[PDB]
């Protein structure tokens, strides 16, 4: 599963999470109004955001380190750890809702696989 979006920006953090996604969107929005095209590989193992014309990996996040995804209109907030020292990537996409729904499914599947690894039947 691969979707296309425009990398807007990123913020950092060190019902509340829904707000944090929001603050991140605004932050990026103010960024834009004061001043690149990518493709997103969604998988159970990870989320790989690449530079469209080049095909160079921009960010490679092991699904387990990602906690939140949000579709705020045509915008997408990808919250991941270590970069509790988290980072929020903001992308504008034609299909932001589809993208978030897809990552959520990845979450659901990988979580099933998670329980199975720990001897738990999902």
């Amino acid at each position: 599963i691969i979707f296309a979006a425009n990398y807007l920006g990123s913020t950092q953090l060190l019902n509340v999470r829904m707000m944090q996604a929001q603050e991140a969107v605004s932050r990026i929005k103010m960024a834009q109004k004061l001043a690149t095209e990518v493709d997103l590989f969604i998988l159970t193992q990870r989320i790989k955001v690449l530079n469209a014309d080049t095909q160079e990996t921009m960010m490679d996040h092991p699904l387990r380190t990602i906690s939140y995804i949000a579709d705020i209109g045509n915008i997408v907030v990808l919250m991941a750890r270590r970069r509790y020292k988290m980072i929020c990537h903001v992308f504008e996409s034609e299909d932001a809702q589809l993208i978030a729904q897809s990552i959520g499914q990845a979450f659901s599947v990988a979580y099933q696989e998670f329980l199975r690894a720990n001897g738990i039947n999902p």
């Binding site: 999470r17 387990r64 906690s67 939140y68 990552i103």
Partner: peptide
Amino acid sequence: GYENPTYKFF
């Protein structure tokens, strides 16, 4: 918004 139940385990 979607929360990954696996994130909190690591």
